[PDB]
Amino acid sequence: QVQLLESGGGLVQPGRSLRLSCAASGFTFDDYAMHWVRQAPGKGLEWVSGVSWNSGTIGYADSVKGRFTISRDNAKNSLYLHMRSLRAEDTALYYCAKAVEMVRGLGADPEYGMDVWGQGTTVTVSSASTKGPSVFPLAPSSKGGTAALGCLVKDYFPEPVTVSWNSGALTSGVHTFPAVLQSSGLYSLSSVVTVPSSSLGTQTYICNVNHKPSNTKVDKKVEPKS
């Protein structure tokens, strides 16, 4: 049972020193190569750092030359990564893992083998002010056909929020599209539901929004501006 525990998350300011710890278990630690993989939120996955079996730093990425540190605690089977001078975009969903290739198996030291991704933490590297959530009804157009109406959650911070539809009564057609991030760390999502168009009168249209950090549970309503 190979296991990797990731710690070092939470709300952190960019530009500040950061400490990330990954604990390894279920396999002999200090005989394998090891890897940190960058993963910008809202984007793909990219290699950021690594280290050899002998605890030798592989190097650093293009934009982070000579300002991160990767080290290995061989005593308690752990690995640490320290970051400095974060910006808004150096935020990443960093992942920890090891290498498949064994010492004296199949020249040169084998260091590839992205194999067992420990669930990487979600270090939130951003500096945004407290924005009161702005939920708003995307009103239904008078659409035979299928009506499309929504609720938009914009200018809110922190990002964690939840939208339910008619308190669970409306389940068919709900799609909460990802919140587009703006220049000033502003979040703007739109939950859109397609509903039968013959029930514009019998249905009172409510959406429930939950901003847990602000304890904002609001039962708003969608009405066509006409």
Question: Which residues of this chain interact with other proteins, rule CB under 8 A?
Answer: 13, 15-19, 37, 44-47, 50, 57-62, 65-67, 69, 71, 73-75, 80, 82, 84-86, 95, 100, 106-107, 111-115, 117, 119, 134, 136-139, 141, 143, 148, 150, 152, 154, 175, 177-178, 180, 188, 190, 192, 194, 225
Q: Is 220 exposed, middle or buried (0-12, 13-18, 19+ CB in 10 A)?
A: middle
Assigned token pair, 214: 């602000």
CB-facing half-sphere around the CA of 107: CA atoms within 13 A: 7
Q: Map tokens 């911070």 to a residue.
A: 157
CB-wise, 67 or 212, nearer to other proteins?
Answer: 67
Q: How far is the CB of 225 from other proteins (least distance, A)?
A: 5
CB-wise, 88 or 148, nearer to other proteins?
Answer: 148
Q: Which residue blocks in the chain are alpha helix, DSSP H? A: none
SS3 47: strand
Q: How far is the CB of 9 from other proteins (least distance, A)?
A: 16
Which residues fall within 8 angstroms of residue 219, CB to CB, at 6 or more apart?
167, 206, 207, 208
CB-wise, 75 or 215, nearer to other proteins?
Answer: 75
- Give the pairing type, strands 11-12 and 124-125: parallel
CB-wise, 66 or 201, nearer to other proteins?
Answer: 66
Q: How far is the CB of 160 from other proteins (least distance, A)?
A: 19
CB-wise, 112 or 160, nearer to other proteins?
Answer: 112
Q: How far is the CB of 182 from other proteins (least distance, A)?
A: 9
The one-letter code for the residue type at 185 is: G
